[PDB]
Ligand binder design. Structure first.
Ligand SMILES: CCC1=C(C)/C(=C/C2=NC(=C\c3[nH]c(/C=C4/NC(=O)[C@H](C)[C@H]4CC)c(C)c3CCC(=O)O)/C(CCC(=O)O)=C2C)NC1=O
Ligand SMILES: CCC1=C(C)/C(=C/C2=NC(=C\c3[nH]c(/C=C4\NC(=O)[C@H](C)[C@H]4CC)c(C)c3CCC(=O)O)/C(CCC(=O)O)=C2C)NC1=O
Ligand SMILES: CCC1=C(C)/C(=C/C2=NC(=C\c3[nH]c(/C=C4\NC(=O)[C@H](C)[C@H]4CC)c(C)c3CCC(=O)O)/C(CCC(=O)O)=C2C)NC1=O
Ligand SMILES: CCC1=C(C)/C(=C/C2=NC(=C\c3[nH]c(/C=C4\NC(=O)[C@H](C)[C@H]4CC)c(C)c3CCC(=O)O)/C(CCC(=O)O)=C2C)NC1=O
Ligand SMILES: CCC1=C(C)/C(=C/C2=NC(=C\c3[nH]c(/C=C4\NC(=O)[C@H](C)[C@H]4CC)c(C)c3CCC(=O)O)/C(CCC(=O)O)=C2C)NC1=O
Ligand SMILES: CCC1=C(C)/C(=C/C2=NC(=C\c3[nH]c(/C=C4\NC(=O)[C@H](C)[C@H]4CC)c(C)c3CCC(=O)O)/C(CCC(=O)O)=C2C)NC1=O
Ligand SMILES: CCC1=C(C)/C(=C/C2=NC(=C\c3[nH]c(/C=C4\NC(=O)[C@H](C)[C@H]4CC)c(C)c3CCC(=O)O)/C(CCC(=O)O)=C2C)NC1=O
Ligand SMILES: CCC1=C(C)/C(=C/C2=NC(=C\c3[nH]c(/C=C4\NC(=O)[C@H](C)[C@H]4CC)c(C)c3CCC(=O)O)/C(CCC(=O)O)=C2C)NC1=O
Ligand SMILES: CCC1=C(C)/C(=C/C2=NC(=C\c3[nH]c(/C=C4\NC(=O)[C@H](C)[C@H]4CC)c(C)c3CCC(=O)O)/C(CCC(=O)O)=C2C)NC1=O
Ligand SMILES: CCC1=C(C)/C(=C/C2=NC(=C\c3[nH]c(/C=C4\NC(=O)[C@H](C)[C@H]4CC)c(C)c3CCC(=O)O)/C(CCC(=O)O)=C2C)NC1=O
Ligand SMILES: CCC1=C(C)/C(=C/C2=NC(=C\c3[nH]c(/C=C4\NC(=O)[C@H](C)[C@H]4CC)c(C)c3CCC(=O)O)/C(CCC(=O)O)=C2C)NC1=O
Lengths: 162, 172, 206, 69, 172, 162, 162, 172, 163
């Protein structure tokens, strides 16, 4: 994955040069920003099942025809898969928050997303809706620094979907 | 490329579960003391030319079979390679410290360097001795607290010492 | 006829690489159509990154669009692609610098390096002027240009005697190719260990 | 490159003068014969090596213009 | 990389004789079957999305450990590689089908895949099973008579099946 | 080797798509022209020996001065070799007809002919008039599109020898 | 755009050499396939209006949940643009038949298709089903070869849509 | 590469001492015989195409089982490869003669060609008779004093003999 | 891997895929004819190396005596032994390159990496510049004719590498 310290290390290695003041300043900034990010991680940790169920039912509201037989949303196992996917997304968002960046998120979902979307006809608009619901409800779950940074992670994932 | 935090996320995904509470508390504790590690590597970097100069000086003090003809470092090019070798060793261990993990150090230096030196004819124990002189000079310059606020950094000293230890073990 | 049969391409398939001697180079010269835009791009991608799959999100749309306009030659796009972070992530990131240089030789010149003196000089260049200087040295190296050209996709010129090329390069890139399937990611552990260094050790002495 | 010096790319217009054609013919046409006049975009960092290599190729510069300032 | 014609030329050259009249007749028969072969290749090309998708759903119905956290195709990139290797196997089998014989695969596609999937840790039997499910989907599409001049491609069905099954065996 | 099917298959492989109208259309053309070319090659095999021996005699009728004792053309094994070589030329022409591609000539004889001739001082013009003899006969021994394509292939063979 | 002879000439100029057999056979292939494509173009010329209309109604039918107010299908300008779109696509299809190649179709619609498809919420499968309808009527309008290559060209249009 | 003078300097560094007077004596002898050396190498260059041609004549007359079909020289591209091989090996042994030190032969010519030919199916024994026919053809031109002052080069003649002996035992 | 006339000749001829033309053969002849004066220079400088090294030691001491002051890196018996050993190495390698009639021995042996040695050990080339200047001053009478300028060329090449 790619966390600010990792880019710092790799870049310093590129030019074959030791670290400097700027990258240590960036590492410092990561260090203080971690605490609100860690709090956001806790908040999303204890709300996981509610997150998943709310996102799935929001998808129901905006896309009920999907649940119609002969389509993707139809089927109890299909919906178990929907919830499992959304839970994976939220777990990787937690990893992103704790990472002070989008490294693990990119590596584990964004690498190869549209390909599988085409493969199983997985419309990215579904997950855009799910993460928009997650954004709206985190508008209540969190506040301030953690809220804003978790929002930026979620909407970065959204823009990657779009 | 992986750090201890990244490896923690790696096991989190290996079990597929979210980041725990206790380990993330450990990560928060690491984040608050990240300034300590930054200061430690800053002392490494500022004193890096001095550290390498002193370690090399004592190195050629103890060993003399290298400066003589047929020595592993006789021509200017060979001992130049030697010098930049210690330089790279210390640099990669500093990278490992910032990561807190030797996986970057392993992937960079220790994937294939030992057999490289075997092919070159370079003896490993000489490089390990150089590494230990590196740690002597490094701890000398780092355990000094000049121009910085004083605090407990025994964990940082131990981490750097252990990283040189595993480097020496890998090479020899 | 002979007691033992020797077909036309027999050397090509007994050596692990046959089609590379048959599959041609690609050039992109005059304004043209999207179909072989993507065809040439896939060829270049499989080429440069050691049969690692170049995942779709990784590619820079701006660089390929600029090459589409043609303000840069294909060589400039190769340079920019080498500057890509994912390139280092695949090769510079998990592998030793000697193995790095061997893979870089294979992937930017199509051949193994000639002698360990080349290895030492190129490591010296890397140490002196950072990462990208060595890549700029390869892509500015005269033999690359005259052999390939400003507008030719690099290919594996190994298994083929180059003008004044070492007898060792053939053996090394035979040992290093091992078919289409051989990927050089952080997995398979073969892109990390410098397979060539043992052979290169013999070159300096005699 | 990112430095203020590294920026200010300079456009280079290159003509295949007779010397370049004579050099390329005797070295061998391992690349397709391209037209004599062609403009090339060269930043400050690799500005010198461009006309260096062109001079060893026998070609001569038409003119040079600066993209930035 | 040989077709039936080119290979026949090759071994005819090997014996150092002219082509045998019966061999000429076999090549003429291949020419007769050429239009059926083109229908088959065109059908294989057309139904590529449907075939790849359907094979995927069979695979994932019968196996779930591949998609489990840490499963050999768990991340999106790794699942994409899982599917794209099977589609490239379809690519090369279609290539052989139009080429008329199975040399091209063993030449270039499956030249060194075994050691690659051992090094990746990939379970070979999983790839094999994917291949037979690809085979099932392919025959399902090829037996379709949509807008094609009726006839008897049973030879072609069998011979493409030989492609599939020998490629699957070579995977092992 | 090299033949229209094989260039198609390579430029679809190394380019990385699935095939469309143009290449399968070329395949249609090849699979339909097979019968003319294949029966033409059959006839060439049917009349080959006259071709080769009369080709030797044709060379001599145009090059008697090369035959006298004391120069290259003199020699019994030399003669057997002459007939042998022109035999391969006819043979590979037949292979070219069968493959319906200029491939086999390229792969075997057009690959590196010039320098082996310079090594052995073999004047290509010799083989050129031998093939001119050959085309003189195939004008009568073969008809229609078959003689057309056979003449085309042997012409390109001369162009190589030229 | 490009026809088969365009790749012919482009390749021949790429190696800087004179045209040998294979590309001339491609020239044939194009010439004899011209006529079937010619009556294919004739039919598509006569039938266009009903084709466009039926595409509109069919896409409104099998996608019912797009027709109602509040999404893309509703709004008169929307289906007016659908009609103009289908007219353009099948005109480019006629161009493909005439060119006997993907050239016009490819460089006119296929280029940049995906990013537009998600740059305006225009679902591609809308257009895949429109072309499936067009297959529906062309399975009856044309016959024999004309039908076959028209089918292939619309299939490639769908394939690039897919 | 490492010429004879380079080898002398390298061994001097290995023993870390100055040159002996006897060293300068052999080196002056080599310098004074360099004129005869140049005459020899010119004899090589002038007749080189002729030498490779008639050597190939004796080889293929001596070994008829190869030019005939099924041989790794039959398809007449292998003519080009074979002739280029004799050309380049004579070129490198000429380099060795001119330098007077067979090191460049060892490096640029015969580091690893044995595996090359075996993996190519070439029977190296044939190559061994090839190079000995090469010496048989060349020594005539070497003894040819046409347009040159006559003299003794038995040292040079034996040196070239051992050069081709090295080539033979090497490729064998 | 040392660069000399005949070695670079072989490398260049190998590079172009060609044999040895008139130019390389004539260059080889020139090398043979120029070796003998180089041989004389090498032997003569080999004879009297003791005086050269001792005089160089005293001369470098005279130029910048403050290095010999206590508390400086030049003061010390081990420092004197190292000075003598180093200057002996320089004259060894200079005689070597005289023998090879090319800077390549010097190039590879010292000119490869010398700069980082000077920077990492604070050994400013000025002392070795004075050492080589003394060597040239003394050899201005030791050799004669061609050998004089031959030795001057390589020692000044070493100077330029140091400078
Ligand atoms: C390739 C053959 C070779 C050369 C050329 C060579 C020169 C040489 N002498 C050295 C040490 C030294 N050399 C000197 C001599 C200096 N004192 C001053 O008067 C002058 C600047 C200069 C002599 C005129 C001294 C004082 C040291 C000790 C430096 C130290 O260890 O701190 C070193 C650094 C290694 C070490 O400190 O052990 C080198 C490379 N050694 C070799 O094996
Ligand atoms: C790296 C961790 C990981 C993720 C994130 C992941 C997503 C994912 N979900 C899938 C299935 C699915 N995904 C969905 C969910 C979508 N379909 C619609 O119905 C919903 C509106 C919408 C939910 C918001 C459904 C219904 C399936 C079952 C049918 C199918 O697509 O194959 C599949 C195809 C294979 C399978 O699960 O059977 C993938 C790759 N897979 C992974 O291994
Ligand atoms: C890297 C992580 C990071 C982010 C994302 C960030 C945004 C940010 N900007 C802030 C200050 C602020 N930022 C804004 C700007 C916004 N408000 C205006 O209405 C506009 C809608 C908009 C600007 C176009 C304002 C008004 C403040 C408070 C006043 C001030 O600037 O001091 C605050 C302090 C308030 C709080 O902690 O809840 C945060 C967190 N800061 C960070 O360290
Ligand atoms: C841009 C790079 C950078 C530097 C150089 C830097 C210096 C620095 N280190 C700090 C934390 C610190 N860092 C250290 C460690 C140092 N003291 C120990 O004695 C050791 C000798 C040594 C480490 C080996 C200590 C003791 C503190 C203060 C305790 C704390 O973390 O709150 C602080 C915060 C002090 C405060 O908030 O009151 C600063 C400004 N900060 C930076 O962001
Ligand atoms: C650096 C100098 C150099 C050497 C030493 C060299 C040997 C050499 N010979 C080769 C092929 C070959 N070599 C030969 C010649 C042999 N086969 C017959 O038995 C002959 C009797 C015999 C000649 C003595 C042939 C026929 C081939 C073609 C095999 C093939 O293409 O598969 C190859 C593989 C590709 C090639 O270069 O053509 C090498 C590397 N190549 C070089 O660039
Ligand atoms: C030229 C012909 C060709 C071959 C022979 C080929 C095999 C191949 N498989 C690869 C990775 C992969 N291949 C697979 C597929 C297998 N593993 C799972 O067990 C699946 C069940 C199974 C699919 C049936 C997977 C999952 C990966 C990703 C593994 C990783 O690198 O992390 C790669 C690395 C490519 C890259 O990412 O740069 C190659 C080259 N690919 C090709 O283009
Ligand atoms: C360095 C990164 C980069 C930049 C900055 C860039 C801009 C850019 N725009 C271009 C032409 C163009 N620019 C436009 C857009 C204009 N025409 C109309 O459609 C619109 C009203 C309007 C847009 C608001 C179009 C349509 C073309 C090319 C015409 C064509 O496709 O034939 C071109 C020349 C040919 C091309 O590639 O399209 C470049 C280089 N491309 C790059 O790779
Ligand atoms: C990133 C991982 C990595 C590292 C760090 C690495 C170092 C390294 N050491 C090398 C050889 C060398 N290494 C040394 C140093 C040794 N000899 C001295 O006397 C000491 C006893 C000892 C060092 C303490 C020397 C002298 C050489 C030259 C080889 C020779 O002349 O035999 C080389 C190749 C020659 C060159 O660089 O020019 C490298 C790249 N290689 C790697 O793949
Ligand atoms: C645009 C490219 C193109 C294609 C693809 C094409 C196909 C094509 N296939 C044909 C015959 C045929 N086509 C088939 C294949 C079909 N019959 C059964 O086997 C299967 C259900 C199915 C396999 C897909 C067969 C069997 C024949 C008759 C040949 C025979 O039976 O031996 C014919 C000749 C029609 C006739 O004279 O009756 C054409 C034109 N034509 C084209 O211009
Ligand atoms: C299949 C491709 C193929 C080619 C291209 C080929 C050329 C070829 N010509 C040869 C001999 C030769 N071939 C000729 C030319 C012929 N004899 C002359 O009298 C006539 C003018 C002429 C026939 C009309 C000559 C003069 C020689 C030299 C015979 C010798 O000196 O031994 C030889 C073997 C050397 C020998 O044993 O004599 C080859 C390989 N052989 C092949 O198998
Ligand atoms: C372009 C490079 C170059 C060449 C080629 C060259 C040849 C050469 N050889 C010479 C003398 C000679 N050359 C030879 C060598 C020949 N005589 C022996 O019989 C052998 C058959 C044969 C050597 C294989 C000998 C023996 C001498 C007499 C010099 C002596 O007494 O040692 C001379 C001086 C007299 C003359 O003009 O002939 C020249 C110029 N000189 C050059 O500068």
């Amino acid at each position: 994955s790619r966390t600010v310290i990792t880019e710092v290390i790799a870049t310093a290695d590129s030019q074959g040069r030791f670290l400097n003041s700027t990258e240590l300043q960036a590492a410092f900034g990561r260090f203080e920003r971690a605490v609100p990010a860690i709090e956001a991680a806790r908040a999303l940790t204890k709300n996981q099942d509610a997150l998943v169920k709310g996102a799935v039912q929001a998808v129901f509201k905006k896309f009920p025809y999907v649940t119609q037989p002969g389509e993707k949303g139809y089927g109890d196992s299909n919906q178990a898969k929907c919830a499992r996917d959304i839970g994976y997304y939220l777990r990787f968002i937690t990893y992103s928050l704790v990472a002070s960046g989008t490294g693990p998120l990119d590596d584990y979902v964004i690498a190869g997303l549209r390909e599988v979307n085409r493969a199983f006809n997985l419309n990215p608009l579904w997950y855009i809706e799910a993460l928009n619901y997650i954004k709206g409800e985190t508008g209540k779950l969190l506040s301030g620094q953690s809220k804003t940074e978790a929002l930026l992670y979620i909407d970065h994932a959204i823009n990657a979907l779009s | 490329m992986n750090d201890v935090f990244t490896r923690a996320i790696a096991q989190a995904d290996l079990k597929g579960s979210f980041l725990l509470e206790s380990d993330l508390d450990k990560l928060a504790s690491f984040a608050k003391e990240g300034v300590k590690r930054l200061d430690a590597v800053a002392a490494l970097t500022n004193n890096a030319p001095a550290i390498i100069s002193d370690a090399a000086h004592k190195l050629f003090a103890e060993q003399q079979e290298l400066i003589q003809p047929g020595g592993n470092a006789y021509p200017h090019r060979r001992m130049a390679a030697c010098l930049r070798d210690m330089e790279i060793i210390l640099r990669y261990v500093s990278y490992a410290l910032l990561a807190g993990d030797a996986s970057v150090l392993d992937d960079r230096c220790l994937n294939g360097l030992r057999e490289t030196y075997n092919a070159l004819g370079t003896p490993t124990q000489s490089v390990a001795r150089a590494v230990q002189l590196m740690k002597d000079a490094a701890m000398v310059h780092l355990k000094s607290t000049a121009n910085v606020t004083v605090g407990d950094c025994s964990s940082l000293y131990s981490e750097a010492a252990t990283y040189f230890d595993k480097a020496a073990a890998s090479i020899a | 006829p002979s007691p033992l049969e020797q077909t036309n391409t027999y050397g090509q398939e007994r050596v692990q690489a046959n089609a590379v001697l048959e599959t041609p180079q690609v050039t992109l010269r005059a304004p043209f159509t999207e179909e072989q835009f993507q065809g040439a791009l896939y060829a270049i991608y499989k080429q440069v990154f050691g049969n690692t799959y170049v995942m779709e999100s990784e590619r820079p749309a701006t660089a390929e669009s600029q090459l589409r306009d043609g303000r840069i030659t294909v060589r400039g796009f190769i340079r920019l692609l080498a500057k890509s972070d994912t390139y280092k992530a695949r090769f510079f990131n998990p592998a030793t610098q000697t193995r790095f240089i061997e893979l870089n030789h294979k992937l930017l010149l199509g051949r193994a390096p000639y002698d360990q003196a080349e290895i030492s000089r190129h490591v010296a260049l890397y140490t002196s002027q950072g990462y990208e200087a060595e890549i700029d040295s390869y892509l500015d190296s005269e033999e690359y240009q005259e052999c390939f050209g400003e507008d030719t996709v690099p290919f594996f010129r190994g298994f083929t005697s180059q003008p004044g090329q070492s007898t060792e390069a053939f053996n090394r890139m035979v040992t290093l190719y091992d078919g289409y399937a051989t990927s050089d990611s952080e997995w398979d552990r073969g892109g990390q260990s410098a397979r060539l260094t043992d052979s290169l050790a013999r070159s300096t002495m005699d | 490159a990112i430095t203020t010096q590294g920026k200010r790319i300079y456009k280079i217009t290159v003509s295949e003068a007779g010397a370049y054609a004579t050099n390329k013919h005797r070295t061998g046409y391992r690349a397709p014969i391209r037209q004599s006049n062609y403009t090339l975009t060269v930043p400050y960092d690799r500005f010198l090596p461009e006309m260096i290599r062109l001079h060893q190729s026998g070609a001569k510069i038409v003119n040079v213009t600066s993209v930035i300032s």
